[model samples]
Target: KGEELFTGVVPILVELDGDVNGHKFSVRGEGEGDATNGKLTLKFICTTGKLPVPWPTLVTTLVLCFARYPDHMKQHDFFKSAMPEGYVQERTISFKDDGYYKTRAEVKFEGDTLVNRIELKGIDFKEDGNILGHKLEYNFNSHNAYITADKQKNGIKSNFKIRHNVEDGSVQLADHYQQNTPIGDGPVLLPDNHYLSTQNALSKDPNEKRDHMVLLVFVTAAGITL
Candidate 1:
């Protein structure tokens, strides 16, 4: 006989039904052992409905969220081809093709510290408003700040700085001293910018010192316009 997973009453099924981006989905099933390896298997029931926002935007956000930090896709294969390169090129680095960007990011549990090891590969940029294949890497730590590499094997450079408070989850840009507030202590914060303000609370209002520095880094990495 199979060993009993839990001593007392076992959890029968986890029925979760909710709307994400206005798309309703429900998952219900019965199982024996722990969550990882339950006995029965079933298909998820998706309630047919209209999406509140455009399909493309919702899809992109979900994909981005998965790729943001260490998760299912971290050690898995993620592929995207023939992506138009206009916004990021104008805002961050020059545009390119066959471009592969991989970011190994981590958010500390205690203080919401963010550490990143990002890389771009097989990027081909064209001179006539085009991009040639190139590879780039970014590494970050608490003390050494941030660094970038054009060539993975030998070309490494450092130019950015960052600091974090593990206890409070406050982050600071060493170069500019801009503050990024924590998401929350144990629960999620209400306002999106709460991450910025929480860190700001540690110091002065409109913490220009930290904000300016972080803004530059954000603009460069995210390639966001303005």
Candidate 2:
């Protein structure tokens, strides 16, 4: 029997470097890798100007403390555009099977300094099929967090929509009763890294017993309650 104990959370770190609209635009994000770790670090830094824009900011420090970030993600291009083509674990200043605590950044400089680094850390992690780009199809308690990461990490559209089980004129709700209900059509639109999802629950009244296609309309990626 394989006994595993005291596992650490796999940290997700991604740095995006590119120029957008003549601005040296780059994104530094901390994905919510450790859901059980208590520190829900679902944060990102969308910076302008020089690559080294200083340690932090006055407005950003104040904004994130007061702003509804997660939900607002959809409204901003920086949020989704922050997303990269793929992901590999790394640390600017900082697991096991997934190569935790085994990442580094290669610094190149003369007139400008560039860094290239790469996987998981001293955290308890398990890698299954399609895990990174790895079987990333799942449900999280926070839908926005899940969608937010997918957009930024995978560089996909984060407009997660909920659809019905039935479609077309021939597609009747009754005809496809108790059938499998899909949420979206493609990879970008589909929700991943999620824990809570729609389910066909028992209805209080009536016999249609419809599947609950639940999601947030105005809920930001932060899902920060105001």
For each candidate, give its TM-score against the true structure. Answer: 0.17, 0.22
For residues 1-226, could you state the per-residue lDDT of candidate 1 as single tens digits?
Answer: 0111222223232233333323343323222212122111222122233322112111101111111211221211110010111001100121222222122211121122111111222123232211111112112232321223222222222232333222234332223211122222222211111011001111122533221111001101111122
Candidate 2 Cα errors over 4 Å, as ranges: 1-7, 30-32, 37-39, 42-226
Global fold similarity of model 2 (TM-score):
0.22
Candidate 2 per-residue lDDT, tens place, 106-202, comes to: 2111121112222212222233312121222122222222222333443322222222122122211100001011122223332333212212221
Looking at model 1, which ten-residue stretch has the lowest summed lDDT?
A: 78-87
Deviation in angstroms for 120 in model 2? 23
lDDT of 2: 0.24
